[PDB]
Amino acid sequence: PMVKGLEKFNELVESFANLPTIGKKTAIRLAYHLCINNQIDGMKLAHNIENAIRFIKPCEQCGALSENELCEICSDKERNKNILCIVESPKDILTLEESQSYNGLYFVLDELNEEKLEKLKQIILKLNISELIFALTHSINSDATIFFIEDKFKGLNLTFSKIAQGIPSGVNLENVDLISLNKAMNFRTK
Amino acid sequence: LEKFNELVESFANLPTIGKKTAIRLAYHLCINNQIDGMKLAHNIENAIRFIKPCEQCGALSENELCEICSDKERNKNILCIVESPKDILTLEESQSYNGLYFVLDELNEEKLEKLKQIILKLNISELIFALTHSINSDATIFFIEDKFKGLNLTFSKIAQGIPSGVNLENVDLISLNKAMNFRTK
Amino acid sequence: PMVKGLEKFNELVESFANLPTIGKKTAIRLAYHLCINNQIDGMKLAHNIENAIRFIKPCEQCGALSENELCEICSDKERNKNILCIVESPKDILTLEESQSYNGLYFVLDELNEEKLEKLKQIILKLNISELIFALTHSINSDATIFFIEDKFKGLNLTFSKIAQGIPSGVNLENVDLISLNKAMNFRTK
Amino acid sequence: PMVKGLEKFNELVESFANLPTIGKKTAIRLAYHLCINNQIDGMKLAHNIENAIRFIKPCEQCGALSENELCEICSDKERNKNILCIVESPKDILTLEESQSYNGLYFVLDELNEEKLEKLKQIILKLNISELIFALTHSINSDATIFFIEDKFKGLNLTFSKIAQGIPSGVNLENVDLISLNKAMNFRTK
Ligand SMILES: [Zn+2]
Ligand SMILES: [Zn+2]
Ligand SMILES: [Zn+2]
Ligand SMILES: [Zn+2]
């Protein structure tokens, strides 16, 4: 065990250690803090975990975090039901809404299940989606996903687009990776 | 989503955890691991309900005596004084010590009387101070040395100086000054 | 005195310290390095400093770094002599050339004095520039420049473009500013 | 090459990248800083490099950085001339001098020759040195050096000491390396 001679303490340490990006040292620090220094924070955390976990489930349509079977976005007819924006995570739906650039629909494609692809295929077929927008990070893996979705949905009159790769605000050109600089120059906008 | 933000805020309150990690952790519990998040909640509650200070030394314990104070193969003639129960976790992890510990988080008369009772009842021969190097800690050491002046006790502290395998130009000047004025044989 | 006792050595230390991003500890390290560990590297550096100060000058046409009257890019017949990319500093030309995304010409627009703008205009005319690329840091002061230049050259039948503002390679969506995100979604590619 | 087209400037950039802890990005910044703005600071840095390489020599007595035959420490009559601190690099003297902990003499023992040791013996006898301090990095190889010097100078009635090994001041135990923590428990002191 990660802590010897403390059955319930070591279980808690183990639980923190199985969280993403949490190492052994941090787990022990967190478990000690909640057991000795602020037990109210621990109880607060446990209640919030159970509170958030039984009331927040993925939207049945797109997968966004939601308190109902359909999220606020899917339950909105004053919304372009002809554009579908594919993302890797539900957090990206919050971010893309915060930008105030898009009024269409979303779909969280965090995995390529045969079953999750079929759900995507049924949204495209039932809403008459004419354009897929890939709002993926610009990365080697996102390439693989766009290629896969490009080969899979070859016959559906779909238009495929992806959010632009380029340079953010207030960044000097030398503080940008060369591959983004290349794309920003080759795909300069008028 | 107020329930999700509350979970994120509970994680950001944790020491050395920022908003970005807090958010990732919350998403991790709300999307996939519904069963594992329920077990983490249970494990928090379970550890808070069972963790208590060891009645003898003050360490983290789930019984009346901790496992170190319950181990008969322990060197019961040496006592190591620390200022936090966490320090026992750290010293145990160093694999350098097989004696007993005493958590001296305060300098009471009841705390000191407890210390004396252990020293007398176990015939302690050496008292090791493993405290942070500071003026306040020096004041604690001198106080214990005088209160227990004539018990035929040996007093030692953990070695202070330059760490192993570090070049002098990366050593803090203040620690370098100490290690030169406290040079050893 | 950062190193007491050694007059000539400490002057070398203070020189490194007087460089951008070079602190005291690094200065002593570099000075020590050149003085004891590799005096040939130090000699190489001193002559290379003198050589570059007596040979590198701003180019007559564009203002890039140059050893001659015209840089290697302006003296290159294989370049697209119909495109001109505007930058703020000659360093930006090095950066853009390393991206291997561009074969046109450059012009350093560090000031907006009318003499600098006539040169630019005469270059656009003499070379028959048909596209003017703005590779500036995306900022409010860059938009004012782009608007100012767009007005001054209103009747030269120029295509005006700007390097893409968008999401850089390998960056999560929440890690970019909302404006670049908004533009990355409004100017999508294929 | 790191900068194409301008070879004199690229040689300067490469000269800076040769410096320990200096990368291509910093090298270009430093080179351009010397070719554009501080054209006279760069000429003085070249002069200070050449001047320091011309004048720096090992102290004839101790081996420290010197500009004369004897360094300033070996020439200081207010120095405690009965104590000798052995270091393995002249940089260590700069560090220990800066600690304000010591007013004795130093000896650079970078090698274990017979001439180096005979020099050491000559200094110990000629100054009637009474204490020998070893300020070497804590390692097994350094332990072999101390034992060698302790034996060679067995019957000179010398005091042998080394700088204190242990946990550094003002660090919590959970942030101390476990191997150093193990040592400091074994070599605990009165
Ligand atoms: Zn939805
Ligand atoms: Zn105990
Ligand atoms: Zn030019
Ligand atoms: Zn000397």
Residue numbers in the entry:
A (entry chain D), C (entry chain C), D (entry chain A): 0 to 189
B (entry chain B): 5 to 189
Authors' text:
The recombination mediator complex RecFOR, consisting of the RecF, RecO, and RecR proteins, is needed to initiate homologous recombination in bacteria by positioning the recombinase protein RecA on damaged DNA. Bacteria from the phylum Campylobacterota, such as the pathogen Campylobacter jejuni, lack the recF gene and trigger homologous recombination using only RecR and RecO. Given that RecR interacts with RecF or RecO for the initiation of homologous recombination, RecR functions as the most critical recombination mediator protein in both the RecFOR and RecOR pathways. To elucidate the functional properties of C. jejuni RecR (cjRecR) in recombination initiation that differ from or are similar to those in RecF-expressing bacteria, we determined the crystal structure of cjRecR and performed structure-based binding analyses. cjRecR forms a rectangular ring-like tetrameric structure and coordinates a zinc ion using four cysteine residues, as observed for RecR proteins from RecF-expressing bacteria.
The crystal structure of cjRecR was obtained at a 2.6 Å resolution using the recombinantly expressed cjRecR protein (residues 1–190). The structure of a cjRecR monomer (residues 1–189) consists of seven α-helices (α1–α7) and six β-strands (β1–β6) and is spatially separated into three parts, including the N-terminal domain (NTD), middle domain (MD), and C-terminal domain (CTD). The four cjRecR chains from the asymmetric unit assemble into a tetramer in the shape of a rectangular ring with a central pore, as observed for other RecR structures. cjRecR tetramerization is mainly mediated by NTD-NTD′ homodimerization and MD-CTD′ heterodimerization (the prime denotes another polypeptide chain). Therefore, we conclude that zinc ion coordination by the cysteine residues is required to maintain the protein stability of cjRecR. The positive patch of cjRecR in the central pore includes positively charged residues, K23, K24, R28, and K90, from each cjRecR chain. First, cjRecR substantially interacted with ssDNA, with a Kd value of 6.8 μM, in contrast to drRecR and csRecR. cjRecR exhibits the largest structural difference in the β4–α5 loop of the Toprim subdomain from the structurally defined RecR orthologs from RecF-expressing bacteria, including ttRecR, csRecR, paRecR, and drRecR.
